[PDB]
Amino acid sequence: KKVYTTPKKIRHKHKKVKLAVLNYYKVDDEGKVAKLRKECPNCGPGIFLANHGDRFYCGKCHSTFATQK
Amino acid sequence: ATRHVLLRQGVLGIKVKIMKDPSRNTSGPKALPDAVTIIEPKEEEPVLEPSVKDY
RNA sequence: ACCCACUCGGCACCUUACGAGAAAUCAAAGUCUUUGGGUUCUGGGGGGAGUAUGGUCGCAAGGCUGAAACUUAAAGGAAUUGACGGAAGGGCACCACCAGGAGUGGAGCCUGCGGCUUAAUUUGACUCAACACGGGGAAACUCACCAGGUCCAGACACAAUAAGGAUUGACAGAUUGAGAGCUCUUUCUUGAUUUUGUGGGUGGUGGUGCAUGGCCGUUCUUAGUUGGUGGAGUGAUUUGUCUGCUUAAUUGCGAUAACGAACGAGACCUUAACCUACUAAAUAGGGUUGCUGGCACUUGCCGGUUGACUCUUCUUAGAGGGACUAUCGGUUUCAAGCCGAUGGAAGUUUGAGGCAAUAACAGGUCUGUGAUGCCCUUAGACGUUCUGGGCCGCACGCGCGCUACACUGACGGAGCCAGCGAGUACAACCUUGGCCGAGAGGUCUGGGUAAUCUUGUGAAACUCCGUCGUGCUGGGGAUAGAGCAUUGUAAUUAUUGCUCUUCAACGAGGAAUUCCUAGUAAGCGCAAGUCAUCAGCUUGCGUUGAUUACGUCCCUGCCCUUUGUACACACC
Numbered sequence: 001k002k003v004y005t006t007p008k009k010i011r012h013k014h015k016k017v018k019l020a021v022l023n024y025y026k027v028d029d030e031g032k033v034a035k036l037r038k039e040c041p042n043c044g045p046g047i048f049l050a051n052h053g054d055r056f057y058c059g060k061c062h063s064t065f066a067t068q069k
Numbered sequence: 070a071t072r073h074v075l076l077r078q079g080v081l082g083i084k085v086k087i088m089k090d091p092s093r094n095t096s097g098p099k100a101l102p103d104a105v106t107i108i109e110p111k112e113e114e115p116v117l118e119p120s121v122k123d124y
Numbered sequence: 125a126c127c128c129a130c131u132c133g134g135c136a137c138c139u140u141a142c143g144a145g146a147a148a149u150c151a152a153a154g155u156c157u158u159u160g161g162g163u164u165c166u167g168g169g170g171g172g173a174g175u176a177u178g179g180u181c182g183c184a185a186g187g188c189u190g191a192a193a194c195u196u197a198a199a200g201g202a203a204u205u206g207a208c209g210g211a212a213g214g215g216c217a218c219c220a221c222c223a224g225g226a227g228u229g230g231a232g233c234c235u236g237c238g239g240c241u242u243a244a245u246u247u248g249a250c251u252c253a254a255c256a257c258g259g260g261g262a263a264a265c266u267c268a269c270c271a272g273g274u275c276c277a278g279a280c281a282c283a284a285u286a287a288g289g290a291u292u293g294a295c296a297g298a299u300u301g302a303g304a305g306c307u308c309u310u311u312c313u314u315g316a317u318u319u320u321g322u323g324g325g326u327g328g329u330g331g332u333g334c335a336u337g338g339c340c341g342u343u344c345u346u347a348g349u350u351g352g353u354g355g356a357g358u359g360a361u362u363u364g365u366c367u368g369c370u371u372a373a374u375u376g377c378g379a380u381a382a383c384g385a386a387c388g389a390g391a392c393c394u395u396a397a398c399c400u401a402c403u404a405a406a407u408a409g410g411g412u413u414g415c416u417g418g419c420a421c422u423u424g425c426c427g428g429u430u431g432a433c434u435c436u437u438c439u440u441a442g443a444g445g446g447a448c449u450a451u452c453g454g455u456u457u458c459a460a461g462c463c464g465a466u467g468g469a470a471g472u473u474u475g476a477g478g479c480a481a482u483a484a485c486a487g488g489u490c491u492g493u494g495a496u497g498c499c500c501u502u503a504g505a506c507g508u509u510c511u512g513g514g515c516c517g518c519a520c521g522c523g524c525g526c527u528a529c530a531c532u533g534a535c536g537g538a539g540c541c542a543g544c545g546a547g548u549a550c551a552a553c554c555u556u557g558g559c560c561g562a563g564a565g566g567u568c569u570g571g572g573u574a575a576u577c578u579u580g581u582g583a584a585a586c587u588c589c590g591u592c593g594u595g596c597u598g599g600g601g602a603u604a605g606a607g608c609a610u611u612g613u614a615a616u617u618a619u620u621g622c623u624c625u626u627c628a629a630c631g632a633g634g635a636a637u638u639c640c641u642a643g644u645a646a647g648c649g650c651a652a653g654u655c656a657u658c659a660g661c662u663u664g665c666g667u668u669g670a671u672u673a674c675g676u677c678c679c680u681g682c683c684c685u686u687u688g689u690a691c692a693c694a695c696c
């Protein structure tokens with residue numbers, strides 16, 4: 001065979017930067033709950049939005065929002 | 070019937086040929102087509118008078 | 125001077141050897157392990173070496189005489205089978221040659237392979253038996269090559285995080301060839317699938333066909349191959365398997381230490397040839413007749429209709445037969461057979477293939493292969509996958525091919541007859557008929573999963589009447605420009621078609637050498653194969669259809685046979 005090329009730069013799959021208890025939602029009293037951000041309009045509650053500078057997208061429906069909140 | 074087979078050292082080239090007997094072949098001819106087998110003849114008695122035999 | 129018989133002396137042959145001998149052979153090389161007639165001489169693996177030395181002899185050359193050290197596993201002899209031989213006879217074959225044909229090589233163009241070039245122009249194959257081959261006509265794919273990126277397709281085993289996440293995803297623009305989350309900008313998803321290591325694998329058009337299998341090719345479709353007894357030899361072996369004549373053939377006659385056998389050849393098989401003799405048909409074709417179109421106009425001629433009735437010549441295609449060199453003539457030991465007439469569809473093994481032995485070859489294939497050994501590799505993968513290229517580049521070498529160098533023509537019309545084929549329902553196949561378009565090609569509609577429709581595939585070359593007449597001319601179409609089509613996601617490095625224009629080389633090709641003996645060669649086209657699209661390619665098919673042998677060993681090759689052979693990895 002002929003020799004291989006070798007530019008240099010290699011790109012690996014990102015490790016993701018995992019995190020737990022992360023870090024939305026709150027409770028002031030104890031019993032009741034006080035949701036932060038919002039839940040999904042399309043799917044049922046339990047799934048939450050993603051808050052950026054006037055841009056949102058969900059996870060269960062890959063990336064399907066548009067309107068602000 | 071050919072069949073490739075291992076072993077560990079390399080692949081072995083088995084072939085097998087079995088010339089089946091014509092008599093027990095059934096399908097096709099019951100004989101190899103060059104094989105001509107002539108039957109035995111049968112004897113008779115010449116003359117013994119012209120003779121007859123009525124009913 | 126013979127003949128004939130026998131004899132002392134000389135020089136040599138034949139057969140059996142029962143005697144010798146390793147055998148070749150030998151009536152001596154016999155009378156030798158059943159060892160002794162007499163005598164002289166020489167040799168003790170090969171070399172070193174007939175050398176060194178010393179004599180001794182010679183004019184000298186040289187002779188006679190004659191070492192070891194060292195070296196080495198064989199050196200020989202004879203024969204056996206091979207292989208080989210610029211040895212000799214005897215065969216065979218248009219992959220040999222004649223007698224001819226068609227050519228190719230020249231011309232242009234395709235298309236192989238060199239060579240050069242390139243980032244890559246991927247490689248295999250190099251006398252027949254590499255070179256229009258890899259079913260290899262590559263636009264990407266294919267793809268192995270190169271420039272770039274992506275992906276894990278990292279089986280399982282054991283451990284480190286084990287939810288205070290193991291890790292999966294990810295629009296927006298910069299990023300990036302790029303609505304590749306390829307990522308760095310991000311801060312939302314995902315729930316133990318995995319990811320980090322170490323064993324271990326998996327894949328790899330990586331490597332080695334000189335590690336192999338299968339298949340193929342090639343010796344060779346040549347006529348060769350083998351054994352069982354029996355003989356000859358100690359034996360390897362051999363004879364059988366051969367002086368001749370035949371055959372396409374080790375095919376047979378025949379002669380014969382061989383007899384009868386098998387393999388291969390043949391037989392066989394498939395196909396192509398013949399059937400007014402069967403069995404059969406509105407998916408094959410005809411006859412009468414109905415309706416119905418036209419004619420001449422008498423009754424007659426052509427039709428068109430799946431209206432009826434019936435038939436099987438053609439057609440298919442079953443089942444049979446048929447050819448056996450048959451009959452006659454010569455000709456040949458009046459054998460095997462060959463040669464000529466007659467008839468007969470068939471008288472070339474009737475034509476063609478299909479299979480095709482022994483033994484092999486370091487032929488070719490690791491790029492058909494989850495056929496594969498072992499070296500490679502195994503996440504920056506030589507894996508995979510996308511994206512663009514590249515195999516097609518050109519001073520130039522050869523190799524199949526095509527088109528022509530015209531008047532046996534070219535161009536117009538007109539006439540107008542084939543066969544093999546092949547073809548879609550989960551796709552997009554063959555695609556008539558009707559309209560549009562100079563074309564190509566669109567479109568509606570069908571028929572067809574096919575002796576039914578495409579399709580009589582009314583294919584071409586041909587045949588007729590005209591235009592030009594032997595001028596690089598209307599021959600010849602290459603190179604070019606522009607457009608109009610079609611395939612596909614994508615056509616520039618024209619995919620192909622069509623349009624008009626360009627009109628180059630080339631007035632039958634040197635040395636060479638290919639193919640060929642009958643429905644063949646040569647011409648012509650069709651056809652499937654590959655194919656979305658491309659035919660100069662190819663395996664089939666049918667059309668037109670000669671010339672010239674119907675022999676020979678002159679060349680080439682091969683084969684035996686005898687001979688030789690310091691060869692046996694076998695003339696590299």
Ligand SMILES: [Mg+2]
Binds near residue numbers: 004005
């Ligand atoms: Mg590379």
Ligand SMILES: [Mg+2]
């Ligand atoms: Mg010695």
Ligand SMILES: [Mg+2]
Binds near residue numbers: 261659661
């Ligand atoms: Mg082709």
Ligand SMILES: [Mg+2]
Binds near residue numbers: 262263
């Ligand atoms: Mg192409």
Ligand SMILES: [Mg+2]
């Ligand atoms: Mg593969």
Ligand SMILES: [Mg+2]
């Ligand atoms: Mg014997």
Ligand SMILES: [Mg+2]
């Ligand atoms: Mg022999």
Ligand SMILES: [Mg+2]
């Ligand atoms: Mg034949």
Ligand SMILES: [Mg+2]
Binds near residue numbers: 333486
């Ligand atoms: Mg080999």
Ligand SMILES: [Mg+2]
């Ligand atoms: Mg491999």
Ligand SMILES: [Mg+2]
């Ligand atoms: Mg090529």
Ligand SMILES: [Mg+2]
Binds near residue numbers: 524
């Ligand atoms: Mg060829």
Ligand SMILES: [Mg+2]
Binds near residue numbers: 579
């Ligand atoms: Mg048809």
Ligand SMILES: [Mg+2]
Binds near residue numbers: 627
């Ligand atoms: Mg001109």
Ligand SMILES: [Mg+2]
């Ligand atoms: Mg040959």
Ligand SMILES: [Zn+2]
Binds near residue numbers: 064
């Ligand atoms: Zn959503």
